[PDB]
Symmetry: C2
Subunit: 154 residues, 2 copies
Amino acid sequence: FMLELAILGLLIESPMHGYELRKRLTGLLGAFRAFSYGSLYPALRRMQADGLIAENRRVYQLTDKGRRRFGELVADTGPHNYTDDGFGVHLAFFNRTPAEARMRILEGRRRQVEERREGLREAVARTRQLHQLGLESSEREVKWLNELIAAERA
Amino acid sequence: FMLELAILGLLIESPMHGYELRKRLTGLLGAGSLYPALRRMQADGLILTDKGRRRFGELVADTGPHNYTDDGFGVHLAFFNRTPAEARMRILEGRRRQVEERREGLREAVARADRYTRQLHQLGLESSEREVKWLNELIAAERAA
């Protein structure tokens, strides 16, 4: 899902060659690694088959069915959107995400990081110095999400 | 994979039941059922048994890529008490390699700049930075004897 969203959301901007998509895909996650070819290209073969993209490696363009399918996925606010990769991908396309969905996604993310923080507070109640590090990160991210939630309300 | 080090490493300390296995086990990250693993680990004669004590001694020595992931690392780091100085050092380095690469992706991510994605990555970055700095301190300490 997060793959298709990533792909569809990139292609909507403009048509792209395989090289560009892999580059951009990697940029959406922050991997310090090309996105793997044998993860990308089978998705494109599938996404071609379902009539979401077309090919002229090559250059790839979005279909009308493609443009619609994106419009679905950007609206989606399911648990798929709250994971680290899920969130970062969706957050990219907040530009094209309705205010309602944005708000839901932010909250679903906040639930996820909140729970992480809780487990880590609980963990520190015990020589894992890494938990402490884990904790401060969560703290920062929650604080950030709250600021981002606050902004959406206003 | 290699949920077994976790169990064996806990178990030898004071062979309890679910109370304290799942509890302590859960305290690797926070907020499942180990039970099929225990049924298996019973069958192979690891549960701790003498064969168990040996099997742990293998696993604590291990320094493979399985040890460098977030869960992998934190589990192993628990049993550093019983991890040979050599293995400890290798594991710390293998972890540092992983976090280094994470940091690089994230530095690179921030560079392209979409205010919101940037800040998230920025957060990601500072965390990596803190963890690397920590690993260095922990590596430094292990050398000094």
